[PDB]
């Protein structure tokens, strides 16, 4: 680890990509939601903002860590304060296409 000590997290996933967002006064541009009992999720990502423009982070992205923080295990409510403290530049580990994922199917007023 660059600073003090740190180690990478390898978990059964299909697509692991790191997203680095820099608060430009406006904000990250994405909400969080404590879906799973371990980790945080992205409720939504403000359109044409910071995350959107970048085109790196995607909605409902299982957040593994935050700027080197152990969130996986705590409640989002506690993470909300972590993002702020983290500072201007934030680096969270988002992953998608998890082993045995659930396929989404549409059906407006069907059946």
Coordinates of C-alpha atoms in Angstrom, one line a residue:
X1 CA 0.0 0.0 0.0
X2 CA 1.2 3.5 -1.0
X3 CA 0.4 4.9 2.4
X4 CA 1.1 3.0 5.6
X5 CA -0.5 -0.4 4.8
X6 CA -3.3 -1.7 2.6
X7 CA -4.3 -4.8 0.6
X8 CA -6.4 -5.4 -2.5
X9 CA -9.8 -7.1 -2.3
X10 CA -10.5 -10.0 -4.7
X11 CA -14.0 -11.4 -4.7
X12 CA -15.9 -13.6 -7.1
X13 CA -17.0 -11.0 -9.7
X14 CA -17.5 -10.6 -13.4
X15 CA -16.4 -7.0 -13.9
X16 CA -14.3 -5.1 -11.4
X17 CA -13.4 -1.5 -12.2
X18 CA -12.2 1.4 -10.1
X19 CA -13.9 4.8 -10.4
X20 CA -12.3 8.1 -9.3
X21 CA -14.5 11.1 -8.8
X22 CA -13.4 14.6 -7.9
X23 CA -15.8 16.9 -6.1
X24 CA -15.9 20.1 -8.2
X25 CA -17.9 22.0 -5.6
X26 CA -21.2 20.5 -6.9
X27 CA -20.8 17.0 -5.5
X28 CA -20.2 13.4 -6.4
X29 CA -23.5 13.3 -8.4
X30 CA -24.9 10.0 -7.2
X31 CA -26.9 8.7 -4.3
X32 CA -26.3 5.7 -2.1
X33 CA -28.6 2.9 -0.8
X34 CA -27.9 0.3 1.9
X35 CA -29.2 -2.7 -0.2
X36 CA -27.1 -5.6 0.9
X37 CA -26.2 -6.2 4.6
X38 CA -22.6 -5.7 3.5
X39 CA -21.6 -2.9 1.3
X40 CA -23.2 0.1 -0.4
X41 CA -25.2 0.6 -3.7
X42 CA -25.8 3.5 -6.1
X43 CA -29.5 4.5 -5.9
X44 CA -29.0 7.0 -8.8
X45 CA -26.4 9.1 -10.6
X46 CA -27.2 12.7 -11.3
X47 CA -27.5 13.2 -15.1
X48 CA -24.9 15.3 -16.9
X49 CA -23.1 15.9 -13.7
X50 CA -19.8 14.6 -12.3
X51 CA -20.2 10.8 -12.5
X52 CA -22.4 10.9 -15.7
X53 CA -20.0 13.0 -17.7
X54 CA -17.1 10.8 -16.7
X55 CA -18.9 7.7 -17.9
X56 CA -17.1 5.4 -15.6
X57 CA -19.4 4.6 -12.7
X58 CA -22.7 3.0 -13.3
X59 CA -26.0 3.0 -11.3
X60 CA -26.5 0.4 -8.6
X61 CA -22.8 -0.3 -8.4
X62 CA -21.8 -2.5 -5.5
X63 CA -19.3 -0.3 -3.7
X64 CA -16.5 -2.4 -2.2
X65 CA -14.5 0.4 -0.6
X66 CA -14.0 4.2 -0.5
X67 CA -10.6 5.8 -0.8
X68 CA -9.3 2.9 1.2
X69 CA -12.1 2.5 3.7
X70 CA -13.7 -0.7 5.0
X71 CA -17.4 -0.1 4.3
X72 CA -18.2 -3.6 3.3
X73 CA -20.0 -4.6 6.6
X74 CA -21.3 -1.3 7.9
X75 CA -24.5 0.6 7.1
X76 CA -24.7 3.2 4.3
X77 CA -25.8 5.7 6.9
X78 CA -22.3 5.5 8.4
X79 CA -20.8 5.6 4.9
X80 CA -22.5 8.9 4.0
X81 CA -20.0 10.5 6.4
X82 CA -17.1 8.6 5.0
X83 CA -17.5 10.0 1.5
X84 CA -17.4 13.6 2.8
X85 CA -14.3 12.9 5.0
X86 CA -12.6 11.1 2.2
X87 CA -12.0 14.5 0.7
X88 CA -12.3 16.1 -2.8
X89 CA -10.9 13.1 -4.7
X90 CA -12.7 9.8 -4.0
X91 CA -11.8 6.4 -5.3
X92 CA -14.4 3.6 -4.8
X93 CA -14.2 0.0 -6.1
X94 CA -17.3 -0.8 -8.1
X95 CA -18.1 -4.2 -9.5
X96 CA -20.8 -5.5 -11.8
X97 CA -21.9 -8.7 -13.5
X98 CA -21.7 -10.8 -10.3
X99 CA -21.5 -14.6 -10.6
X100 CA -25.0 -15.9 -11.2
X101 CA -26.6 -12.5 -11.7
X102 CA -30.4 -12.0 -12.0
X103 CA -31.6 -11.1 -15.5
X104 CA -34.0 -8.2 -15.7
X105 CA -37.1 -8.5 -17.9
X106 CA -39.5 -5.7 -18.8
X107 CA -43.3 -6.0 -19.2
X108 CA -45.5 -2.8 -19.1
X109 CA -49.1 -3.8 -18.4
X110 CA -48.3 -7.3 -19.8
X111 CA -49.8 -10.7 -18.8

